[PDB]
A paper describes a structure:
In the fourth step in this pathway, UDP-2,3-diacylglucosamine is hydrolyzed to 2,3-diacylglucosamine-1-phosphate (also called lipid X) and UMP. This step is catalyzed by the specific pyrophosphatase LpxH in 70% of gram-negative bacteria, including E. coli and Pseudomonas aeruginosa, and by LpxI in the remaining 30%345. LpxH shares sequence similarity with metallophosphoesterases and requires Mn2+ ions for phosphatase activity. PaLpxH consists of two domains: a catalytic domain homologous to metallophosphoesterases (MPEs) and a helical insertion domain (HI domain) inserted in the middle of the catalytic domain.
Proteins without Mn2+ ions were also successfully crystallized in two different space groups. A C2 form was obtained with no Mn2+ ions added during crystallization, and a P21 form was obtained by adding EDTA prior to crystallization.
Residue numbers in the entry: 2 to 241
Amino acid sequence: SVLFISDLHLEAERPDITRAFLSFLDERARRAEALYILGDFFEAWIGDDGMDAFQRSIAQSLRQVADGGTRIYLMHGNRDFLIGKAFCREAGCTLLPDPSVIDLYGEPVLLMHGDSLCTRDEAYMRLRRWLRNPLTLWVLRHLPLATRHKLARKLRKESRAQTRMKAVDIIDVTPEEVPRVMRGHGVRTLIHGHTHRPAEHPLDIDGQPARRIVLGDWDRQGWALEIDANGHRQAPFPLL
Ligand SMILES: CCCCCCCCCCC[C@@H](O)CC(=O)N[C@H]1[C@@H](OP(=O)(O)O)O[C@H](CO)[C@@H](O)[C@@H]1OC(=O)C[C@H](O)CCCCCCCCCCC
């Protein structure tokens, strides 16, 4: 079996989420063939060179699971798109680009964090285009660590202000983007996070049924999607 999680937003000041995650690693990820983390694993990331004691300890916990034979893949989200090779080497995980198509029990399956689908959120689309611009990444990594933390706090503050003001239809995925990107990748299954609305959505692509599975965020309870050759299930579990 294979596990999918996202939107944990791990941080030092949420030990309840950390405890749930570490229990999940021991109880479920150790026995899985693979674990996919589809973005926003951490609350924020300023670059691997800024990793703190807490973040290093999370890397070590992943490494224990990877060394047991579980393959771990990590995809960027909007909080942690600066995770690099140094972190993944310490964690024993593989960095997966957004988007990625994997083979899952013989079916091609598209994986994304999900924010790139939110094309009606024009203010966010503009921010994303600027944040991911190679010129932006260049200047950002030339900022001192403390100044990077300052700008990360400022972005979080403005995001918290602005997201409260937006309608749910503006911040959720644009419906017609889903068949468009799934057709382009030749898949009938898409798995993503970001939107915090765990669900499975049936849809049509060119007269053929397809599905979009949305992973849950861990703010109030943990979530995991588990797939094996016979079926799949997403279910929550309590934070510790
Ligand atoms: C190198 C270190 C520093 C730089 C890199 C740091 C990386 C870590 C920081 C993460 C910030 C991230 O939270 C921003 C973001 O992604 N917001 C969108 C997201 O909301 P979340 O709050 O992340 O859950 O998802 C929401 C739903 O999709 C969406 O709504 C939010 O997007 C916004 O709210 C964006 C606003 O609409 C526009 C904000 C522009 C802010 C400009 C601030 C800079 C000040 C400029 C002064 C001239």
